[PDB]
């Protein structure tokens, strides 16, 4: 897969530093209330969620290549980001119907790729839940949906970042040993599908192809995999796309994520960055409520910075430039 228009390339560059994506993300649009819900008794507010987002944006984007935000609540935050940091806006509705197994994708009702571009984004991000082994008609609908979005992004000449989260229709918990044994299959086969030209993806945002918590040396409990087997999953992942791809952090600590990046590189993965945030800013939330907005600012300038700086130093030794895939 080898194409970038002049504008898509300029946008990718705005999202990167020396071909590496070190992008700052937020978690959901409801998750933040709960981290706040620890105290007071209020749910406060639309006014305040937009604020902490603006504090995290303003203080930490100077050290990130870009920031990913939600349009429904993140636009104020997007306007206070560093001038040297690019912007991705999410296009999907969050969550899924737990009562069914289909997890069908659905774009935000009053958004379009055109509107995302008009709001100043350098990329459209869309999250798809995909079970390669799932219902074939469900997956046809999902493929059709991504084709439309890839087409929109082609027309608006804006990079398409497709996030894939894998699951199994018949496995309740994706942290389970049961899901771990098939994760490589789910992750890598999904990448093969959505690497096809017809879906118009510019960058894949994906899980590491193994639950490192069950790998020898990284596991606290039961061991399902040797380091050699885990490494093979990373090489298989590298072989599953020619597109740039970046890793999301899921279910692991900042330290284990960083150890995973080192292990990915060692194994032969040519990942081109990461898109994580929660670990980087999560601590600012309590401080925000125990000492106020100015103190959260202080947290971000010191602890927040230390977090993202640590990560960047790791990225500097492990990530590969996406320019090498062009």
Cα 252 versus chain centre, distance:
14
Among residues 16, 22, 166, 249, the one that binds ligand M2P under rule CB under 6 A: 249
Distance CA 225, CA 243 (A): 27
Tell whether residue 248 is a contact of ligand M2P (CB under 6 A).
Answer: yes
From 47, 109, 220, 222, residue interacting with a second copy (rule: CB under 8 A): 109
Return the residues of window 145-174 that contact ligand M2P according to CB under 6 A: 163
Give the orientation angle of helix 177-194 with respect to helix 227-238, to 10 degrees: 20
Per DSSP, 120 falls in state T
172 binds a second copy (CB under 8 A): no
Query: Which segment (98-106, 147-155, 182-190, 247-255) binds ligand M2P by CB under 6 A?
Result: 247-255
Interaction mask 88-107, a second copy, x per CB under 8 A: -------------------x
To ligand M2P, the closest distance from the beta carbon of 87 in angstroms equals 14
> Which residue, 295, 280, 319, 310, is CA-closest to 61?
280
HSE toward the beta carbon, residue 132, CA cutoff 13 A = 16
Q: Which residues contact 242 (CB under 8 A, 6 or more apart)?
A: 1, 2, 195, 325
Q: Rounded to an integer, what distance in angstroms lies between the CA atom of residue 164 and that of residue 310?
A: 26
- Binders of ligand M2P among residues 33 to 92 (CB under 6 A) are none
Smallest separation (angstroms) from ligand M2P to the CB of 25: 4
Q: Does 185 bind a second copy (CB under 8 A)?
A: no
Buried b (16+ CB within 10 A) or exposed e, 9-43: eebbbbbbbebbbbbbbbeebeebeebbeeeeeee
* Cβ at position 130, least distance to a second copy in Å: 16
Residue 29 binds ligand M2P (CB under 6 A): yes
One of 3, 28, 45, 100 touching ligand M2P (CB under 6 A):
28
User: Quick check: 27 binds ligand M2P (CB under 6 A)?
Assistant: yes
State the DSSP code for 229.
H
Return the residue of 18, 84, 106, 140 that touches a second copy, per CB under 8 A.
140
Footprint on this chain of a second copy (rule: CB under 8 A)? 107, 109-115, 137, 140-141, 144-145, 147-148, 151-152, 154-156, 198, 200
């Amino acid at each position: 897969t080898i194409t970038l228009t002049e504008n898509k390339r300029k946008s990718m560059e705005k999202l990167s530093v020396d071909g590496v994506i070190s992008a700052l993300a937020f978690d959901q649009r409801g998750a933040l209330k709960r981290m706040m819900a620890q105290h007071q008794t209020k749910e406060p507010t639309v006014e305040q969620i937009e604020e902490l987002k603006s504090l995290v944006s303003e203080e930490l984007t100077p050290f990130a290549s870009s920031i990913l935000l939600d349009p429904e609540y993140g636009l104020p935050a997007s306007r206070v980001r560093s001038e040297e940091a690019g912007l991705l806006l999410a296009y999907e509705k969050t969550g899924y119907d737990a009562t069914t197994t289909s997890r069908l994708p659905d774009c935000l009702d009053v958004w379009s790729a055109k509107r995302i571009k008009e709001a100043g984004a350098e990329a459209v991000k869309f999250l798809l839940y995909y079970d390669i082994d799932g219902d074939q008609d469900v997956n046809e609908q999902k493929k059709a949906y991504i084709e439309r979005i890839g087409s929109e992004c082609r027309a608006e000449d804006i990079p398409f970042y497709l996030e894939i989260l894998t699951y199994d229709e018949k496995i309740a918990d994706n942290a389970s040993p049961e899901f771990a044994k098939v994760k490589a299959h789910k992750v890598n086969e999904a990448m093969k599908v959505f690497s096809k030209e017809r879906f118009g993806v510019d960058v894949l945002k994906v899980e590491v192809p193994v639950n490192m918590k069950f790998v020898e040396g990284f596991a606290d409990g039961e061991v399902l995999f040797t380091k050699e087997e885990a490494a093979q999953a990373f090489r298989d992942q590298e072989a599953s796309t020619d597109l740039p791809y970046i890793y999301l952090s899921a279910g692991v600590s900042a330290k284990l994520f960083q150890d995973t990046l080192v292990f990915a590189a060692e194994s032969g993965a040519k990942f081109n960055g990461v898109l994580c945030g929660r670990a980087t800013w999560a601590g600012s939330v309590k401080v925000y409520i125990e000492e106020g907005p100015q103190a959260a600012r202080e947290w971000l300038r010191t602890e927040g910075f230390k977090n993202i700086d640590e990560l960047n130093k790791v990225l500097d030794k492990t990530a590969s430039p996406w320019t090498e895939k062009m």
